[PDB]
Design a protein around this ligand. Structure first.
Ligand SMILES: [Mg+2]
Ligand SMILES: [Mg+2]
Ligand SMILES: [Mg+2]
Ligand SMILES: [Mg+2]
Ligand SMILES: [Mg+2]
Ligand SMILES: [Mg+2]
Ligand SMILES: [Mg+2]
Ligand SMILES: [Mg+2]
Ligand SMILES: [Mg+2]
Ligand SMILES: [Mg+2]
Ligand SMILES: [Mg+2]
Ligand SMILES: [Mg+2]
Ligand SMILES: [Mg+2]
Ligand SMILES: [Mg+2]
Ligand SMILES: [Mg+2]
Ligand SMILES: [Mg+2]
Ligand SMILES: [Mg+2]
Ligand SMILES: [Mg+2]
Ligand SMILES: [Mg+2]
Ligand SMILES: [Mg+2]
Ligand SMILES: [Mg+2]
Ligand SMILES: [Mg+2]
Ligand SMILES: [Mg+2]
Ligand SMILES: [Mg+2]
Ligand SMILES: [Mg+2]
Ligand SMILES: [Mg+2]
Ligand SMILES: [Mg+2]
Ligand SMILES: [Mg+2]
Ligand SMILES: [Mg+2]
Ligand SMILES: [Mg+2]
Ligand SMILES: [Mg+2]
Ligand SMILES: [Mg+2]
Ligand SMILES: [Mg+2]
Ligand SMILES: [Mg+2]
Ligand SMILES: [Mg+2]
Ligand SMILES: [Mg+2]
Ligand SMILES: [Mg+2]
Ligand SMILES: [Mg+2]
Ligand SMILES: [Mg+2]
Ligand SMILES: [Mg+2]
Ligand SMILES: [Mg+2]
Ligand SMILES: [Mg+2]
Ligand SMILES: [Mg+2]
Ligand SMILES: [Mg+2]
Ligand SMILES: [Mg+2]
Ligand SMILES: [Mg+2]
Ligand SMILES: [Mg+2]
Ligand SMILES: [Mg+2]
Ligand SMILES: [Mg+2]
Ligand SMILES: [Mg+2]
Ligand SMILES: [Mg+2]
Ligand SMILES: [Mg+2]
Ligand SMILES: [Mg+2]
Ligand SMILES: [Mg+2]
Ligand SMILES: [Mg+2]
Ligand SMILES: [Mg+2]
Ligand SMILES: [Mg+2]
Ligand SMILES: [Mg+2]
Ligand SMILES: [Mg+2]
Ligand SMILES: [Mg+2]
Ligand SMILES: [Mg+2]
Ligand SMILES: [Mg+2]
Ligand SMILES: [Mg+2]
Ligand SMILES: [Mg+2]
Ligand SMILES: [Mg+2]
Ligand SMILES: [Mg+2]
Ligand SMILES: [Mg+2]
Ligand SMILES: [Mg+2]
Ligand SMILES: [Mg+2]
Ligand SMILES: [Mg+2]
Ligand SMILES: [Mg+2]
Ligand SMILES: [Mg+2]
Ligand SMILES: [Mg+2]
Ligand SMILES: [Mg+2]
Ligand SMILES: [Mg+2]
Ligand SMILES: [Mg+2]
Ligand SMILES: [Mg+2]
Ligand SMILES: [Mg+2]
Ligand SMILES: [Mg+2]
Ligand SMILES: [Mg+2]
Ligand SMILES: [Mg+2]
Ligand SMILES: [Mg+2]
Ligand SMILES: [Mg+2]
Ligand SMILES: [Mg+2]
Ligand SMILES: [Mg+2]
Ligand SMILES: [Mg+2]
Ligand SMILES: [Mg+2]
Ligand SMILES: [Mg+2]
Ligand SMILES: [Mg+2]
Ligand SMILES: [Mg+2]
Ligand SMILES: [Mg+2]
Ligand SMILES: [Mg+2]
Ligand SMILES: [Mg+2]
Ligand SMILES: [Mg+2]
Ligand SMILES: [Mg+2]
Ligand SMILES: [Mg+2]
Ligand SMILES: [Mg+2]
Ligand SMILES: [Mg+2]
Ligand SMILES: [Mg+2]
Ligand SMILES: [Mg+2]
Ligand SMILES: [Mg+2]
Ligand SMILES: [Mg+2]
Ligand SMILES: [Mg+2]
Ligand SMILES: [Mg+2]
Ligand SMILES: [Mg+2]
Ligand SMILES: [Mg+2]
Ligand SMILES: [Mg+2]
Ligand SMILES: [Mg+2]
Ligand SMILES: [Mg+2]
Ligand SMILES: [Mg+2]
Ligand SMILES: [Mg+2]
Ligand SMILES: [Mg+2]
Ligand SMILES: [Mg+2]
Ligand SMILES: [Mg+2]
Ligand SMILES: [Mg+2]
Ligand SMILES: [Mg+2]
Ligand SMILES: [Mg+2]
Ligand SMILES: [Mg+2]
Ligand SMILES: [Mg+2]
Ligand SMILES: [Mg+2]
Ligand SMILES: [Mg+2]
Ligand SMILES: [Mg+2]
Ligand SMILES: [Mg+2]
Ligand SMILES: [Mg+2]
Ligand SMILES: [Mg+2]
Ligand SMILES: [Mg+2]
Ligand SMILES: [Mg+2]
Ligand SMILES: [Mg+2]
Ligand SMILES: [Mg+2]
Ligand SMILES: [Mg+2]
Ligand SMILES: [Mg+2]
Ligand SMILES: [Mg+2]
Ligand SMILES: [Mg+2]
Ligand SMILES: [Mg+2]
Ligand SMILES: [Mg+2]
Ligand SMILES: [Mg+2]
Ligand SMILES: [Mg+2]
Ligand SMILES: [Mg+2]
Ligand SMILES: [Mg+2]
Ligand SMILES: [Mg+2]
Ligand SMILES: [Mg+2]
Ligand SMILES: [Mg+2]
Ligand SMILES: [Mg+2]
Ligand SMILES: [Mg+2]
Ligand SMILES: [Mg+2]
Ligand SMILES: [Mg+2]
Ligand SMILES: [Mg+2]
Ligand SMILES: [Mg+2]
Ligand SMILES: [Mg+2]
Ligand SMILES: [Mg+2]
Ligand SMILES: [Mg+2]
Ligand SMILES: [Mg+2]
Ligand SMILES: [Mg+2]
Ligand SMILES: [Mg+2]
Ligand SMILES: [Mg+2]
Ligand SMILES: [Mg+2]
Ligand SMILES: [Mg+2]
Ligand SMILES: [Mg+2]
Ligand SMILES: [Mg+2]
Ligand SMILES: [Mg+2]
Ligand SMILES: [Mg+2]
Ligand SMILES: [Mg+2]
Ligand SMILES: [Mg+2]
Ligand SMILES: [Mg+2]
Ligand SMILES: [Mg+2]
Ligand SMILES: [Mg+2]
Ligand SMILES: [Mg+2]
Ligand SMILES: [Mg+2]
Ligand SMILES: [Mg+2]
Ligand SMILES: [Mg+2]
Ligand SMILES: [Mg+2]
Ligand SMILES: [Mg+2]
Ligand SMILES: [Mg+2]
Ligand SMILES: [Mg+2]
Ligand SMILES: [Mg+2]
Ligand SMILES: [Mg+2]
Ligand SMILES: [Mg+2]
Ligand SMILES: [Mg+2]
Ligand SMILES: [Mg+2]
Ligand SMILES: [Mg+2]
Ligand SMILES: [Mg+2]
Ligand SMILES: [Mg+2]
Ligand SMILES: [Mg+2]
Ligand SMILES: [Mg+2]
Ligand SMILES: [Mg+2]
Ligand SMILES: [Mg+2]
Ligand SMILES: [Mg+2]
Ligand SMILES: [Mg+2]
Ligand SMILES: [Mg+2]
Ligand SMILES: [Mg+2]
Ligand SMILES: [Mg+2]
Ligand SMILES: [Mg+2]
Ligand SMILES: [Mg+2]
Ligand SMILES: [Mg+2]
Ligand SMILES: [Mg+2]
Ligand SMILES: [Mg+2]
Ligand SMILES: [Mg+2]
Ligand SMILES: [Mg+2]
Ligand SMILES: [Mg+2]
Ligand SMILES: [Mg+2]
Ligand SMILES: [Mg+2]
Ligand SMILES: [Mg+2]
Ligand SMILES: [Mg+2]
Ligand SMILES: [Mg+2]
Ligand SMILES: [Mg+2]
Ligand SMILES: [Mg+2]
Ligand SMILES: [Mg+2]
Ligand SMILES: [Zn+2]
Lengths: 118, 59, 131, 122, 16, 204
RNA sequence: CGAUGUCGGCUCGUCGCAUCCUGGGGCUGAAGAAGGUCCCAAGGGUUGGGCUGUUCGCCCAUUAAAGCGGCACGCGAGCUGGGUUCAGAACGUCGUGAGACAGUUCGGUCUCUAUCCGCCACGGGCGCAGGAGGCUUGAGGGGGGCUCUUCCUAGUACGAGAGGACCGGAAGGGACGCACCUCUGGUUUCCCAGCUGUCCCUCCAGGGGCAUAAGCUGGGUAGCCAUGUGCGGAAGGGAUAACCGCUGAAAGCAUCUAAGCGGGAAGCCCGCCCCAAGAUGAGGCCUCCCACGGCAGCCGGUAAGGACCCGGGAAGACCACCCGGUGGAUGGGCCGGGGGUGUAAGCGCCGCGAGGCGUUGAGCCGACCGGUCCCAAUCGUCCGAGGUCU
RNA sequence: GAAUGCCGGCAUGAGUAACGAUAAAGAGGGUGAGAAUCCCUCUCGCCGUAAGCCCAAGGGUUCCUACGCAAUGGUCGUCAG
RNA sequence: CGUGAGGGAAAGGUGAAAAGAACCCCGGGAGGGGAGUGAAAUAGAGCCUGAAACCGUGGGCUUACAAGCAGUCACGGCCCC
C-alpha cells in the first residue's frame, strides 16, 4: 500500500534520490532547459520551484538555504540576480514540463523537457 | 523446492492460444495542427517543434 | 465541501478556552472531576507535563509525578469537560518537545535538567497585574 | 498486560517481594490481566519469615500496571511498575498494609479493602 | 509412531 | 425502512455524560427521490435516491432524460434504498433521531493483493529455528492423493478490501440538520470522502 | 524397488460421530443443588505451561470442556529435521578376528524458475437479435453459528441442616469475526533538532558529502496499523429429532396412530451479512438514439454513446475500477490553516573562554484540511444503430 | 517406431528465469545513418594496507596509431583486450 | 579435449562455360528490386537434387453451454471438381 503517500522513489535510496534532484536542479538553473525522463521531470518542478521561490525572498537566510542544495556560490548568485527577478510577480509555477514525442532507443524511455518559464 | 518441470510438450494449438493476447496496438497518433504531420497526442511536435500553438523547440 | 471545516464544526461545541497555556517541562496541577462512592469529587494531580500531542480539539497532554515511591503518568484530553481548572505551579525550561528521558532520571538529575523558565515566570508575573 | 511469566512487584506486607504470573483467572483463555484482575502466581522472592515464602502458589489482584489503562472519560493512567496484592479466596488481602497507589478500577471490582488500605488511589 | 524408515535420507540431485 | 446516501467525512470524539464518544461524522442530506420502484411496475418496493449535484456539462443524454422525467436537477450518484417509500420528494437527516440504531454500508479501504497473514490472519512461519523462506507463507493447502485437489473457498493470497461492507447497529449520537450531519458512534467502512448508505437497523 | 521420502513438530484445514462442552430429552437407588445411565444432536467450541525427539503419557495452573477417530498413521515440488538409514568416534555387549547390535552415546549436504488439473485473485473475447447510459430482481452460492460469571426473582420452592433451584429478567466478561484510526500505542529512509570523526565550500561564521542499503541519537504528521475503538453471533417466523401429549379404533377395556390434531433442540429451512443473470433458463425497470447512403449478407458516413490520449486517485502487480481534462481545482507550484520540531541565520549585549541572554515559540517544515488558473491535463483521432422470421 | 539406442536437424517450456556483487548516478556539449552505453565538460557517488604504484610467475602482441562493426561483448555501440 | 601418456571430430557437388550479374534504384551496410548472362538463376555463389520434423503468409470449411486415446459409423449443412 502507498495510500496518500507523496513522492516518487525513482529506484534510488535516500541519499541518491536527493543528489539526483540537486544535480538536476543545478542543471536546470544552469541551462534554463534540460531533457530527462518524464517522471524525473515531474519531480523536478517542485524541487526547483522552492529554490526559485526562496531566491525571490532574497534575504541571506534564503541564500544559505538554497546553497545547501545548490552549493555553487556563482550559480546561486545567478539564481538570485537573473532568475528570481523575472518571477517577482509570478506566483509559483516557475517551471514547466512538456513531453517529447520520441522515446530513447536503448531503453525506450519516454522523454520530456523541463524548463524555467518566461 | 523440487524442480517443477512441464509434464507434456505444449501443443501448437495451446501455445498459440496463449498468444491470443499478444498483438500490439498501433501507436495512437493525432495530426499536428501546425504542420499536419502525424504525431502522439500530448507531445511537442517533432516535425516542427510546435506545441499549444507556439514554437517550443528547434527541430 | 470542506471535510476539515465540518469536523471543526462538530467540535466547536466542546472546545474550551478557559485553561492556561503550558509547555512540556512546566509543572502543573490538574483538578479533575472523578467518580467514587457514591459521589463525584475533585482530585488534584500535580506534575511535570512530559508531553503535549496536538490535534486541535483532540490534543492531549501527559503529566508525570512520583506518588508514594512509584512513578505515575496521567494522560488528559486538553478539552476534557472533567478538568475543573489547571494551575501552573512552576515553569520549567525544556529543550525538547517530549520529555520521556525524565522517566530514568533521578530527582537530582531532573531538577538540574529542567531549570526554572525564568523568562516565562517573569512573563507570568507581568500579567497578573490587573485593573 | 500481565501474562504468564510476567514478574510483578507485590505491594503489600505479606513478605512476598516478587511474583511470577502463572495464569490469568479470567475465563477459559484470557491472554492478559490488567488492573482488578486476579492472577495465580508463584512466589519467586520473599523476605524471611513472612506469611508467604518462595515457592508458594498464591493469588493476587493486579493493582497497577506499566501498560496504561484507558477510562471511559477519555483519559488514561500509567504506573512505573506492575504490582499486585496477594489475596485469599474471598478477594481479601492476606497482608495488612498496601504500599504505593492503586488504580481506582479496583473499587468498581470489589477490592474495597485494598482500595482503602492504599495510601493513594489514582 | 516410529517404524522402519524405507528410504535413505535423500540428497539433492547430482548434476546431469 | 428508511435510508439515506452520504459521504464519510471523518472521526472525532464528543463528550457525552462525562464520556468520550468515538464518532464518525457523515454528511447525509439532502437526497432527492428520482424514481420510485413499485410492485406493479417494477416487482418490488424501493426508492431510487440521488445525491451530490453534478455539472450538467458532465451528464450525458440518456442520463438527463432520466433526471428530467423526475424534475430533478442532475446529481452525481443514484442509489436505491429498499422497502422505503418516503412521503416527500426529498430525504434528509431528519429521518434519524439521536438514540436510534443504524447500519452503515461503505466500500472498504482497498489493500490490493494481500498476503495470507493480512487477509486471513494466518499464523505464517517461524522467524528462526530453521524457517526457510516461508515466514509469511500459508503452510499446507491440502491432504495427499485423497482428495487430490483444493477445496473451493480455501483461504489464499489475493485482493482484499475495496468491497461492500456493512457495519451494523450503530448508535446515532447526534444529528445536525442545518449542516446535514449525522454523527454515528464507532467506525464506518472506507476512506474519508467515500460514499456510504445509512439505513435503519435490522437488529432488535 | 528405470524411487509411492519414511517418526514427531509447525502451518493450514476438512470430514465422521461411537459427543468432551454447549442445546433437547427418558430412567434414576432423581427432595434440592450435584451426579449417574441411556436417547436425540456434528452448529459452534474444545486453553496455557514443566518433562521428553517423541506420538502417547504423567504433572502444574486454569476451563463450559480441556472428545476420539479419518483424510498416503492428511499435509517435506509448504517449512522443520529433534527421532530414524550411510560414511567419523566411543561405551556396554557379542565375536580369535575383520566386524556386529527389533542397545546406548556425540557429530553428520532436505533441489531458486509450476506445463496440465485444482485453488485464490484479476482481466481480455464473444454472447445475451437494434444500438446505448443508468438503476436493479435474486435463481443459486458463500460467510456467520461458541460460551461463562454475577445480580434480581429468592436465601423463596425443596431440605432436620449444610446446602439450594426450575421459569422469568438484568448486568459484565473470555476467545473469535468484520470494519476502523477519534483516543491509546506502534512505525513513520530525510519532516525537525542535537552529536562525533573526516574531507570539502570560503579563512571566520554558516553549511554539504561520507560514516547503511538513515553515520549516530532524541523526536515525529498523513498512511499503513494492534496492544486501541465500534459492531457481530441473535431476535423472530417455519418445519422437525429424541421425547411428551389430545382425540381414537382395530381389540366393548387400553393405546400419541391405524384417520386426524398438538408440543418439542445450540441442530434443519427462512431471517442477518457478502457474491451472484455466462441464471446461455443470459431476468426486470427508467432514460437516450433511429426509421442514413452504395450493393437475418456485404461496403461506407454518422446517431445516442464509447474508446484512444492526457492529469490523477486511501483503486491498483499489468489489466481493471473511480475521478478530472481549460464549459477545468486533476496533479505540481504558490498561499492560508493543521501538524512536527522546539526558540534559525544575522545582529546586539554579558563572559578571558566553552557558553549564556534578547530579537523569537523563532526558523525550518512530506503526505493532512482548504484557496488560488502561476505550471501542466494543448490539439485531436478512431470506433459506434439503420433493428431476422412466425 | 521403440534398445534412458547412435548422429544430425528442429520443436516445448517462453517472450518465461536470467543479463554475474545494492560503489550510483544526472545534465550539457561533440561525433555519427544510428547514441542511456563512444569523446569532452561540470555535478554526484565508490576504493584509497586499495579497487593506487612497482617487481616475479604465468600469458604471448593483448602495446601505439589509422581505417572498421558481420561476429565476439550477457543490452547498445560510432567503442573495445 | 587432457599436466601427460592419451582421446579425437565435423566439413564433398553453381554452370557446358564464370558468361560469377556493368549500370540504375532503396539502404550506413547486409539485403533486395530492375537491367544483364545462361537451355535453365526458387542453377546467384548461405549455389545439383532438395524429403521430413519445424516456422509462416493467403484461401475453403469449422468453432465461444462444451466433457475429449481425438477416431469411427450415420445423417444433414457449406465449399470444390
Ligand atoms: Mg511496502
Ligand atoms: Mg495524493
Ligand atoms: Mg507515490
Ligand atoms: Mg523524497
Ligand atoms: Mg529497476
Ligand atoms: Mg539507478
Ligand atoms: Mg533508502
Ligand atoms: Mg549516496
Ligand atoms: Mg549514506
Ligand atoms: Mg510543497
Ligand atoms: Mg506534454
Ligand atoms: Mg509517448
Ligand atoms: Mg541505443
Ligand atoms: Mg523441497
Ligand atoms: Mg517449486
Ligand atoms: Mg531452498
Ligand atoms: Mg526449478
Ligand atoms: Mg511433470
Ligand atoms: Mg510446436
Ligand atoms: Mg499455427
Ligand atoms: Mg496454453
Ligand atoms: Mg481532519
Ligand atoms: Mg485523593
Ligand atoms: Mg526453596
Ligand atoms: Mg538425483
Ligand atoms: Mg421480476
Ligand atoms: Mg457504496
Ligand atoms: Mg490499496
Ligand atoms: Mg502471509
Ligand atoms: Mg484480515
Ligand atoms: Mg493480525
Ligand atoms: Mg504464529
Ligand atoms: Mg509471527
Ligand atoms: Mg519456533
Ligand atoms: Mg535448513
Ligand atoms: Mg529467512
Ligand atoms: Mg506425503
Ligand atoms: Mg479426487
Ligand atoms: Mg478490487
Ligand atoms: Mg449529544
Ligand atoms: Mg479515511
Ligand atoms: Mg519400491
Ligand atoms: Mg518412472
Ligand atoms: Mg524417479
Ligand atoms: Mg510422488
Ligand atoms: Mg482432524
Ligand atoms: Mg448419536
Ligand atoms: Mg445436557
Ligand atoms: Mg436436579
Ligand atoms: Mg439428595
Ligand atoms: Mg439425564
Ligand atoms: Mg458439533
Ligand atoms: Mg461441520
Ligand atoms: Mg469436532
Ligand atoms: Mg526451564
Ligand atoms: Mg514441551
Ligand atoms: Mg510430550
Ligand atoms: Mg511416554
Ligand atoms: Mg458443567
Ligand atoms: Mg494439554
Ligand atoms: Mg503421514
Ligand atoms: Mg492401516
Ligand atoms: Mg491426524
Ligand atoms: Mg508428513
Ligand atoms: Mg524437504
Ligand atoms: Mg514431516
Ligand atoms: Mg507433498
Ligand atoms: Mg514432492
Ligand atoms: Mg507439494
Ligand atoms: Mg509431490
Ligand atoms: Mg510453508
Ligand atoms: Mg539427525
Ligand atoms: Mg540427540
Ligand atoms: Mg530415544
Ligand atoms: Mg551410500
Ligand atoms: Mg555416522
Ligand atoms: Mg552413526
Ligand atoms: Mg563412549
Ligand atoms: Mg567392551
Ligand atoms: Mg549382543
Ligand atoms: Mg570372545
Ligand atoms: Mg573379547
Ligand atoms: Mg550387516
Ligand atoms: Mg554410550
Ligand atoms: Mg558441530
Ligand atoms: Mg546420532
Ligand atoms: Mg534448507
Ligand atoms: Mg500455468
Ligand atoms: Mg492434467
Ligand atoms: Mg468478462
Ligand atoms: Mg471485457
Ligand atoms: Mg438464495
Ligand atoms: Mg451455476
Ligand atoms: Mg436471596
Ligand atoms: Mg455476551
Ligand atoms: Mg490522526
Ligand atoms: Mg495514532
Ligand atoms: Mg491518537
Ligand atoms: Mg501516537
Ligand atoms: Mg533533510
Ligand atoms: Mg561534517
Ligand atoms: Mg567553521
Ligand atoms: Mg567524498
Ligand atoms: Mg569514501
Ligand atoms: Mg552501523
Ligand atoms: Mg555508502
Ligand atoms: Mg543526513
Ligand atoms: Mg550517538
Ligand atoms: Mg516514539
Ligand atoms: Mg528515529
Ligand atoms: Mg504518523
Ligand atoms: Mg486487539
Ligand atoms: Mg462483545
Ligand atoms: Mg431459532
Ligand atoms: Mg413447531
Ligand atoms: Mg396418559
Ligand atoms: Mg386417550
Ligand atoms: Mg384386549
Ligand atoms: Mg396418522
Ligand atoms: Mg408431532
Ligand atoms: Mg404438550
Ligand atoms: Mg446461540
Ligand atoms: Mg448486489
Ligand atoms: Mg444479463
Ligand atoms: Mg445484477
Ligand atoms: Mg443449468
Ligand atoms: Mg439484461
Ligand atoms: Mg488512465
Ligand atoms: Mg496509475
Ligand atoms: Mg472521461
Ligand atoms: Mg479534449
Ligand atoms: Mg489542482
Ligand atoms: Mg493545489
Ligand atoms: Mg501547506
Ligand atoms: Mg501551524
Ligand atoms: Mg504548532
Ligand atoms: Mg535564543
Ligand atoms: Mg538567533
Ligand atoms: Mg566581548
Ligand atoms: Mg505552514
Ligand atoms: Mg477561480
Ligand atoms: Mg490534432
Ligand atoms: Mg518394435
Ligand atoms: Mg528420455
Ligand atoms: Mg533422452
Ligand atoms: Mg537416442
Ligand atoms: Mg530412432
Ligand atoms: Mg544419441
Ligand atoms: Mg538428439
Ligand atoms: Mg524454443
Ligand atoms: Mg511478459
Ligand atoms: Mg512459466
Ligand atoms: Mg515471472
Ligand atoms: Mg520462469
Ligand atoms: Mg546466470
Ligand atoms: Mg526479471
Ligand atoms: Mg553487471
Ligand atoms: Mg547488476
Ligand atoms: Mg548489501
Ligand atoms: Mg550524454
Ligand atoms: Mg546530447
Ligand atoms: Mg550509445
Ligand atoms: Mg547507437
Ligand atoms: Mg554503466
Ligand atoms: Mg568519455
Ligand atoms: Mg570503506
Ligand atoms: Mg590511509
Ligand atoms: Mg592464454
Ligand atoms: Mg591478435
Ligand atoms: Mg607500450
Ligand atoms: Mg594491437
Ligand atoms: Mg589498445
Ligand atoms: Mg577509431
Ligand atoms: Mg560488432
Ligand atoms: Mg552491432
Ligand atoms: Mg549491427
Ligand atoms: Mg569486413
Ligand atoms: Mg556478441
Ligand atoms: Mg551486441
Ligand atoms: Mg558475458
Ligand atoms: Mg562510424
Ligand atoms: Mg574489448
Ligand atoms: Mg586430466
Ligand atoms: Mg592442450
Ligand atoms: Mg581417452
Ligand atoms: Mg563422430
Ligand atoms: Mg560443377
Ligand atoms: Mg565444375
Ligand atoms: Mg549441359
Ligand atoms: Mg547508399
Ligand atoms: Mg549489393
Ligand atoms: Mg529491394
Ligand atoms: Mg540485385
Ligand atoms: Mg536470355
Ligand atoms: Mg531443352
Ligand atoms: Mg526447381
Ligand atoms: Mg537447378
Ligand atoms: Mg542449404
Ligand atoms: Mg549436375
Ligand atoms: Mg538447391
Ligand atoms: Mg533450399
Ligand atoms: Mg517443406
Ligand atoms: Mg490460416
Ligand atoms: Mg446449461
Ligand atoms: Mg454453440
Ligand atoms: Mg462421433
Ligand atoms: Mg441415422
Ligand atoms: Zn508540426
Amino acid at each position: 500500500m502507498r495510500h496518500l503517500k507523496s513522492g516518487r522513489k525513482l529506484n534510488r535510496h535516500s541519499s541518491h534520490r536527493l543528489a539526483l534532484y540537486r544535480n538536476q536542479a543545478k542543471s536546470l538553473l544552469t541551462h534554463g532547459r534540460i531533457t530527462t525522463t518524464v517522471p524525473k521531470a515531474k519531480e523536478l518542478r517542485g524541487f526547483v520551484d522552492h529554490l526559485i521561490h526562496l531566491a525571490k525572498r532574497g534575504d541571506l537566510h534564503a541564500r544559505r538555504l538554497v546553497l545547501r542544495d545548490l552549493q555553487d556560490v556563482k550559480l546561486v548568485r545567478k539564481l538570485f540576480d537573473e532568475i528570481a527577478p523575472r518571477y517577482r510577480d509570478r506566483q509559483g509555477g516557475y517551471t514547466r514540463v512538456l513531453k517529447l514525442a520520441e522515446r530513447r532507443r536503448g531503453d525506450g524511455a519516454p522523454l520530456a523537457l523541463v524548463e524555467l518559464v518566461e | 523446492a523440487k524442480h517443477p518441470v512441464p509434464k507434456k510438450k505444449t501443443s501448437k494449438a495451446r501455445r498459440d492460444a496463449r498468444r491470443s493476447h499478444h498483438a500490439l496496438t498501433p501507436p495512437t497518433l493525432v495530426p499536428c495542427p501546425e504542420c499536419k504531420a502525424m504525431k502522439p497526442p500530448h507531445t511537442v511536435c517533432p516535425e516542427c517543434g510546435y506545441y499549444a500553438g507556439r514554437k517550443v523547440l528547434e527541430v | 465541501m470542506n471535510r476539515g471545516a465540518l469536523i471543526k464544526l462538530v467540535e466547536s461545541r466542546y472546545v474550551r478556552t478557559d485553561l492556561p497555556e503550558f509547555r512540556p517541562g512546566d509543572t502543573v496541577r490538574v483538578s479533575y472531576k472523578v467518580k467514587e462512592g457514591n459521589r463525584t469529587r475533585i482530585q488534584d494531580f500535580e506534575g511535570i507535563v512530559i508531553r503535549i500531542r496536538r490535534n486541535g480539539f483532540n490534543t492531549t497532554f501527559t503529566v508525570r509525578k512520583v506518588s508514594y515511591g512509584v512513578g505515575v503518568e496521567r494522560i488528559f484530553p486538553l478539552h476534557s469537560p472533567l478538568i475543573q481548572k489547571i494551575d501552573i505551579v512552576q515553569r520549567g525550561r525544556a529543550r525538547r518537545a517530549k520529555l520521556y528521558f525524565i522517566r530514568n532520571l533521578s530527582d537530582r538529575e531532573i531538577r538540574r535538567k529542567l531549570r526554572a523558565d525564568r523568562k516565562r515566570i517573569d512573563q507570568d508575573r507581568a500579567a497578573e497585574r490587573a485593573a | 498486560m500481565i501474562q504468564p511469566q510476567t514478574y510483578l512487584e507485590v505491594a503489600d506486607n505479606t513478605g512476598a517481594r516478587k511474583i511470577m504470573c502463572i495464569r490469568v483467572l479470567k475465563g477459559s483463555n484470557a491472554k492478559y490481566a490488567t488492573v482488578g484482575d486476579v492472577i495465580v502466581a508463584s512466589v519467586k522472592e520473599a523476605i524471611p519469615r513472612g506469611a508467604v515464602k518462595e515457592g508458594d502458589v498464591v493469588k493476587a489482584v493486579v493493582v497497577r500496571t506499566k501498560k496504561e489503562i484507558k477510562r471511559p472519560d477519555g483519559s488514561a493512567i500509567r504506573f512505573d511498575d506492575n504490582a499486585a496484592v496477594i489475596i485469599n479466596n474471598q478477594l481479601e488481602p492476606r497482608g495488612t498494609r498496601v504500599f504505593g497507589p492503586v488504580a481506582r478500577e479496583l473499587r468498581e471490582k470489589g477490592f474495597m479493602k485494598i482500595v482503602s488500605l492504599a495510601p493513594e488511589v489514582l | 509412531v516410529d517404524k522402519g524408515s524405507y528410504l535413505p535420507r535423500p540428497t539433492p540431485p547430482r548434476p546431469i | 425502512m428508511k435510508g439515506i446516501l452520504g459521504v464519510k467525512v471523518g472521526m472525532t470524539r464528543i463528550f457525552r455524560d462525562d464520556r468520550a464518544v468515538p464518532v464518525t461524522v457523515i454528511l447525509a442530506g439532502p437526497c432527492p427521490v428520482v424514481q420510485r420502484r413499485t410492485p406493479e411496475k417494477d416487482g418490488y418496493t424501493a426508492v431510487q435516491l440521488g445525491f451530490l449535484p453534478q455539472n450538467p456539462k458532465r451528464v450525458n443524454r440518456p442520463l438527463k432524460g432520466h433526471f428530467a422525467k423526475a424534475g430533478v436537477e442532475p446529481v452525481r450518484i443514484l442509489r436505491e434504498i429498499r422497502d422505503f417509500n418516503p412521503e416527500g420528494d426529498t430525504v434528509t437527516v431528519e429521518i434519524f433521531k439521536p438514540g436510534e440504531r443504524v447500519d452503515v454500508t461503505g466500500t472498504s479501504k482497498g489493500r490490493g493483493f494481500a498476503g495470507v497473514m493480512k487477509r486471513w490472519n494466518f499464523a505464517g512461519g517461524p522467524d528462526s529455528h530453521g524457517a526457510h523462506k516461508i515466514h509469511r507463507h500459508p503452510g499446507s493447502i491440502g491432504n495427499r492423493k485423497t482428495p487430490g485437489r483444493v477445496y473451493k473457498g480455501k483461504k489464499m493470497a489475493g485482493h482484499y478490501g475495496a468491497e461492500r461492507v456493512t457495519v451494523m447497529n450503530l448508535e446515532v449520537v447526534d444529528v445536525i440538520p442545518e449542516e446535514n450531519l449525522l454523527l454515528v458512534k464507532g467506525a464506518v467502512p472506507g476512506p474519508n470522502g467515500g460514499l456510504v448508505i445509512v439505513r435503519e437497523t435490522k437488529k432488535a
